[model samples]
Structure formats: C-alpha cells, structure tokens
Target: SLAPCGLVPSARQLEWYNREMIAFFHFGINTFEEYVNEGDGKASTAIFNPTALDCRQWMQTLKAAGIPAAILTAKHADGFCLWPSKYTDYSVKNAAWKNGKGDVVREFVDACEEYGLKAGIYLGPHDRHEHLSPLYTTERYKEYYAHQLGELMSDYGKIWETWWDGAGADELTTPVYRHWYKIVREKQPDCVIFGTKNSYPFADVRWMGNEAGEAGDPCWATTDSVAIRDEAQYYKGLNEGMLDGDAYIPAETDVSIRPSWFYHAEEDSRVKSVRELWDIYCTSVGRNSVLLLNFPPDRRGLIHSTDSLHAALLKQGIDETFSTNLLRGAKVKATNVRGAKYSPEKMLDNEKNTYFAGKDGEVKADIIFTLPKTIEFDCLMIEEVIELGHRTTKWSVEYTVDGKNWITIPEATDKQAIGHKWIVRLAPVKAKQVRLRIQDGKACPAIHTFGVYKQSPVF
Candidate 1:
C-alpha cells in the first residue's frame, strides 16, 4: 500500500459518507408564520398553522430521492421552536395549532422512524427572539442553549447527527464553543456534531466553504496541520481548509432546493431543475464529499409539488444511468503489484478495504481491463484509498477500441491530481479494453475503486 495520505476519517465519518447523500428539512415556525427572513425573535407562533401537515409525506418523498437521512431545523435564527422548550416563550406548543399541543419535532422524528429513514436536528445557537434581551450574555444564553440540547438529545430516540447552526467571524462569539462541546458529547456520544466554522475540536463534520453544492477538485480529506487549536486561526482554512495536511474532518456541501432555504410562493416556478440538481451530484458526491440538499417545507407543513417532481427526476437520472457496471466481472491484469496482496481483481470485488497497491520502484503501474465484448461506456469514477491518504499526483485512463490502438481518455482537470473521486468523462465510445495508468504519484498509489459508468448529466 502507499504511504499514509497524512489523514484518515473517523469511523463515524466513514459511516456518514457511506450513505453518500442525505436531505435537509429547512422547515420552521417562520415557514407558516410568513416572515421568511425575520431578524428579530418577534414572529408570532399564532399564525403557524399547517392544516394539512404531513411529515410522513416528506419522508416518503425523500425515500424516492434515495437519500437515507433528513435533518430537521428544530429552530432557526428567529427563536421559534417547533417543540416546547422550558426556557422559551415562543414555541409551537404555545401556538393555536391543534389548540397549543403540537410537537413538530416529535412528528418529524416519528415519521422518520416509521419510514426507516435516519433523523438529525439543526439547533441554531443565535436566537433572534432572545438575542436582543438584556439577559443575553454569552454565559446566560448558553445555559438555555444547553437546556435545549438536553431536551432534543434526550427526547429523540436516536439522532444520527446534531447540527450546530453556529458560525464564524463577526456573528457568533467563541465563548459558546465550550458549552456545546461539553453538553453534546456528554449527552449524545453516538451522534456526530456538524459545525460551520473550521473548529474540528467541537464538531465531527465541517461545512464545505459554500452553500452552492460544490467541493474542491482535489478534495483531500486531510489538512497540513491542526489549525483548530485556537479560536483565532479558525478563518485561515475556512473554505477549502488545508489541501495537504493532517486532519480527517470531511466536507458536506449544502444547497437549497428552492432559491431560499424557506419557501416563497414566488419561488415555486424557480425551483431547481433536474439539470441543476444533477450537476451538484457530479461535483459534491461525485467529488467524494456528502451532499445535503435542503428541501424546504411550505406553510402547509409539506414539500411543494414542484420541488417533489425535481427530486424524483434527480433520482431517476442517477438510477437509470448507473444501472450496472460494465466491468463487473471483467478480466483485469496489472503490471506492478506484489505476488497477490495487491491484485487487479480487488477493484471489481466491491470492497473498499481492498485495492490494487502498486510497488514504489516500478517505472509506472498500469492495469488493463478486458470486457466480455465491446460494450459502450461514457464515464469513469476513480478513488484513492484515502483512509491510507491520497497518493496519486497524476493519472490517465486509456481505451482500445480495436484491442491494439489505444487512445488516452480525455481528462477535464488538465493536470490537477485526483485525490478522492475523479470522474473521468467522455462521449460514449465502444471499447473492448481500457487501461488505468498512474503516470506519476507520491509513494505508490493505492487505487480503491476503478469504476466505469454511462453518465446522465447536465454536468
């Protein structure tokens, strides 16, 4: 195997990215309350009424999208709670909905369990409702925050993730970090905490620089050094983080289904198209990071029909395009592995722990895949066994239509290295043999998955 890529994700991260994709439910009291961008915690809960609120329908819709988990924003910045909190005056339990007895959080979690989908919650640290009060010291407000965490973490049967709607530079104070780390770790040890800032010590997941649903091309999961030691240096590695470093926190790319996180009647016609969603998949999940597509619920406590239609189309394009692997049982032979420890067959065995490991001293290691016949293929996906670290610096995929005259597969990234998932794309071609060539690398390359696909794209 190649030398360590200098970093490796924790078991929790492995489990999370293994799901590849997840959904985010951005619904809140402001959804029905009609103040989409409330800066103050003054939106009345009385206007919050989803006469046909059906979280089960939400779960059912996501199942069609093939996403395994959905994160609910229990409370947004407006300080309104979908469930009652002892420290709050603004909450759904105080609303006129169902005569002040509705617990949206309970119904959401229950719907997830019923549909067999994993559940998570986004608890915002900045409360517009409480921020302006005279009692809003960093320490005093943290007590209420800790109390809220206790309720959500304790009440929810199993929270797969706990997202901190915490932030950076000008907005949130660094003092609140300690309280979140202490209470969350003590309460829900199994659930992973996702922080927006580059503070890995307080959280297990880090947000990829933007909310645009894209990741860095050579998205190395490691950093050069741990910059999270002090709260001061947090912004330095803010977006891309460290490309050649020693940290293991993976990135999650979040983007909204609608133009805004909360629904607007005006945006119904402006919902993201199938092509827009597919491009996101190619860049985020296609680049080895997780995709968190936010599907906002409307005033009726349900996803809009336009949003639902696009969601299904995204799933259909993915499912139909990658229906089967062309190289499922193809005969593969490599030029540079030891006796049997790093055979070419490992790439097709459907195992991440096993990969073709090339020796360091050879001129260059290359593998030839011979298909049963001249099958048509349009795209390829390649990955390094990054749990050991990223080693490949340059690589090439070549195909032989006539079994003798080989042509290099046109690469899109010029000479940028393929760190995680390098989707090599090309127009459809008929070929009987294809070769994966590591032209240059650090140490020896540990090629994890050598995949072939017929792409469906607006990518």
Candidate 2:
C-alpha cells in the first residue's frame, strides 16, 4: 500500500464525485410568479397550480438521461414551501394544488426512490414572505428555519445533499449558521451540505466560481481555511483551490437547461440544445467537477417535451463519445513503479480506486502503452487517484505510428493539474502506441484511470 500524499476526500465526497453528473429540479412557486410581480413576497397561494403534476414522469425522464441524483426546490426564496409544512400557513397547505393537500416534496422524494436516483432538498435562506410577517424576529425566524429544516431532514427518506442558498446572508449582523448545521448533522449525519458562502463545518461542498457550467481549469480539491475566511477569498478559493490547504472541498458547477431557473412559456423555444449541453458536460465533468444541470418542470409539473428531448440526446452523445476505448487490452509499461501492486496495468483496470504510482521521489516519469493493433482516436482521458489527493501538476500525451518515432500532441503537452478527471480532445491520429509522460507534480504521480477514445460531434 502507498502512503497518501495529502488531504483526500471523505467517503461521502468520494461517492459524490463518482456520480460526476446530476440533475437539479427547480420547480416551485417561482414557476408561477414572475420576479417583478408586486406580489413577489405576498403572492396568493391560490396562484400555485399544477394541472397534471406527475413526478414519476420527471424522474423517469431524468433516469433515462443518465442522471443518477436530483435535487428538488422544496422551498425557493419566495418562502413558498413545496411540502405542507406545519410551521407556517405560507406553504403548500395554503395552496390551491390538490385542494391544499398536496406535498410536492413527498412526491419528488418518492419518485427518486422509484427511479433509483438519489434525492436532495434545496431550502433557500432568505424568505421574502417571512420578511413581511408580524412575528419576524431574528431569533424567531431562526427557530422557524430550524423547524422547517428539521421537517425536511426527518421526513425525507435519505437526503444525499442539502442546498442552502446564501443570497441575503450578508445583510444580517448576527448570523447563526451553527444551529442550522447542527439540525442537519443531527438528523442526517451523512448528507453533504452546499452552503454558498459558509465556512468549514457547514459547507461540505463549495460552489464553482460561476453558474455558467464551467469549472476553473486546474481546480484543486484542497483549500486553506484562511483562504476562505472572507467573501473575496471565498470566491477565489471556489475557483482555484490551494494545493497545500487544510480542507477537502470539491466544486459543483450548476447551470440551467433553460435561460432561467424557472420555466417560462415565452422561453420554451430557448431551451439549451443538445450541443450546448454536451459542451457543458465537457467543461464541467470533463474538468474534474460534478455538473448539476437544472431542469425546471413546466407549469403542468412535467418535464417539458423540448427539454426532455434535448436531455435524451445529450445522453446519447455521451454514450457514443465514450463507447470504445482504443487503449483496452493494450500492454502497459512504466519507467518507475512503487511496487508490484502499483503496476502500470492498474491504469487500464477501470476500477475506481486502483492506481499506478511512481516511487516516492520519482515525480517525472513515463508510462507507455502498446496497443493490440493500430487504431485511430482523437480524445484522451485521465484521472488522478484523488483518494490519495491531487498530486499530478503537469502532464502530456504522445503517440507513435512506428516504434522509433514518437510525436507529442501539442494540445496536451502543457496541460495543468488533473484532479478527479481530465478529458483531452485531440486531432484524430492513427497510432500503434501511446505515451503518458508525467512532467511534474507535488509528489510522484498517482494515476487511477487512462483511456483513448474516438469521439463523434454532438448535434
């Protein structure tokens, strides 16, 4: 066994990273009320209406599109609860849907269970509705928030994540996030929390720099506590994590399938196409971060036809792009090996944890692969043994048509860090051999996965 190089992910984080891509269901009162409505904070509960609410269809559509997990907007900033909360009358209990008897949260979680997709809850912190209430005290409001969180945590079967949006947190002079953390931790000890700007002990996962569905290049998983001490540093840390930092907080790149978070009839024609979604997939999951693509259910409470069609095609594009790995069944040889257990062959085993490692001081080395036969390919894939932490800093790829001559692929020769995974697109080339040269890193390289694939363009 090799000694770990630095900070690594928790079991929970490892599982989350393995998911790679997940879905975000942003369906709520916001689906009906426009942002500029004078009734923004005081919108009538009667406005909430889903004529044909079918969460089963939502989950089935997502499952078919290769989404393994989903997060439902149980409550948006409007203070409108999707579930029938007992804390206040400003929830689904007062809504028109199902004659005030419907629980959208219940249906969402149940649908996830039925479709084998993990479920999560999104509870926005700034409650506009609560701000206009007569019983509004910071203390009273916190208790109300805790009670709401408690209900969601205890009622949901098993929440994989809890998304807490920190939009208006800056205005509050006395912020007591600890209580909120305690409630979630006590009830669901394993659920990962995505607190937009909160610090350690609260934010198990940090946000990517933007909601544009692109991860920062060379994004590290480790971050210093001091680096996230202030909002500015926090923002910077979210983009590029410190290699020698104290925490292990990975990033999640979130974006919407449509132009806005909520569905609008006017914007139905503006849903992102299959090609756009594919580009996001490459920039997000391909850049070592999990992609959380949001799909807001329309007013009918069903995945829109255009949205579903694009999603299905995105799945198809993904399948076709990675259907075959030219490096399969190839013989591998490395310049340096830590042990017999850390053989070069581990890189091709397709196991999540097994990795090929160089000796402790051998940071620069090469691993050559001789294919079974000459093959044409245009894309290359690599993954760091992140459980041992992100050690590889710089790397390059090369190919050889004849044994004596090796040509370096300039596109990847000066590439940066490889965290969870890196998918490098190259011009098509016919080769009998490939070489992975580890140029430099903080420690000897630990590579878990390597692949060569011929990819097709998405429409």
Judged by lDDT, which candidate is best?
A: 2
Pairs that collide in candidate 1 are: 5-388, 5-389, 41-128, 41-129, 223-245, 223-246, 224-245
Candidate 1's TM-score: 0.90
- In candidate 2, what are the lDDT values of residues 179-217, reduced to their tens digit? 888888888887888865543446777776677888777
Looking at model 2, the pairs that clash are: none
| C-alpha lDDT of all candidate models, in order | 0.75, 0.83
Identify the candidate with maximal TM-score: 2
Residue lDDT tens for model 1, 98-151: 888888999999999999998998888777777779777767877888899889
Residue-pair clashes, model 2? 0
- TM-score of each model, in listed order: 0.90, 0.95
